Amino acid sequence: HAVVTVPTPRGAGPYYTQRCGETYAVYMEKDKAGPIENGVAKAGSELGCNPFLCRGYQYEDNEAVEYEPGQVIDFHVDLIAGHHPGYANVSIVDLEANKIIGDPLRSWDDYPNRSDIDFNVTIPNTLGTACSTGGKCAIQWYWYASGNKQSYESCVDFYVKA
Ligand SMILES: *[C@@H]1O[C@H](CO)[C@@H](O[C@@H]2O[C@H](CO)[C@@H](O[C@@H]3O[C@H](CO[C@H]4O[C@H](CO)[C@@H](O)[C@H](O[C@H]5O[C@H](CO)[C@@H](O)[C@H](O)[C@@H]5O)[C@@H]4O)[C@@H](O)[C@H](O[C@H]4O[C@H](CO)[C@@H](O)[C@H](O)[C@@H]4O[C@H]4O[C@H](CO)[C@@H](O)[C@H](O)[C@@H]4O)[C@@H]3O)[C@H](O)[C@H]2NC(C)=O)[C@H](O)[C@H]1NC(C)=O
Ligand SMILES: *[C@@H]1O[C@H](CO)[C@@H](O)[C@H](O)[C@H]1NC(C)=O
Ligand SMILES: [Cu+2]
């Protein structure tokens, strides 16, 4: 059980409830640190979002922050319950394709272990126009608890002027 608290990641809003459905939205907001699979299972055929992209949180409910190439961003992860074994990465995802841009900004082969709950990441110089405006990219923190086959996600929407 864990979730990013800094920077402020995407949270619930109207499009979230509309697109994921009441069952997913209500189950997943009773514990913002819970894994995704349990919400998918409860929702069954009601589910209408991709809960493996930003936990199903939606761009239109949130606002993208402006970052400069080479800028360093401090992350804090509120860790309610550690699970072993497992791995994590923090990467820039292209929201339209659901594919990572370039390399992971940070990778752990064993997560959690404190360079795991309090860490930073650097914006590349190599992004081009790919993140030029809001809603094209986000920084996704992703943790897979292999022991429990549990997925944890948080997103930070951002743009870099190209
Ligand atoms: C580093 O962190 C990153 C994140 O930043 C991690 O990457 C993520 O890892 C997860 C887990 O692997 C990925 O989620 C999974 O994605 C699966 C692959 O699918 C995509 O393929 C194509 C082309 O890209 C798309 O078209 C697909 O989209 C379609 O489906 C989605 C919804 O799934 C729709 O919204 C679209 O409209 C498309 O039609 C995919 O994006 C995906 O299969 C998988 O979901 C299956 O599994 C879950 C349960 O686990 C089910 O709820 C769901 O129904 C899916 O089930 C299908 O497949 C299984 C077989 O596995 C069958 O049993 C089912 O019956 C059914 O056919 C899940 O969404 C995530 O996308 C990926 N994120 C990235 C890359 O950004 C890295 O792993 C991590 N790495 C390290 C080292 O840390
Ligand atoms: C970023 O993380 C490294 C690794 O902990 C740390 O030592 C470094 O000083 C941090 N940089 C900033 C600017 O906070
Ligand atoms: Cu947990």
Numbering used by the authors: 1 to 113, 120 to 168
From the reporting publication:
Copper-dependent lytic polysaccharide monooxygenases (LPMOs) classified in Auxiliary Activity (AA) families are considered indispensable as synergistic partners for cellulolytic enzymes to saccharify recalcitrant lignocellulosic plant biomass. In this study, we characterized two fungal oxidoreductases from the new AA16 family. We found that MtAA16A from Myceliophthora thermophila and AnAA16A from Aspergillus nidulans did not catalyze the oxidative cleavage of oligo- and polysaccharides.
A search with DALI55,56 revealed high structural similarity with AA9, AA10, and AA11 family members, but MtAA16A has a significantly smaller size than the matched structures. The methylation of His1 is confirmed in the structure. In the crystal, a carboxylic residue from a neighboring molecule blocks the equatorial position to the copper, expecting to bind water in solution. The surface adjacent to the His-brace in MtAA16A lacks the typical flat aromatic features seen in most cellulose-binding LPMOs and exemplified in the complex of LsAA9A with cellohexaose by interaction with a Tyr. At the surface of MtAA16A, another Tyr residue (Tyr27) can be found near the His-brace but lies sideways rather than parallel to the protein surface.
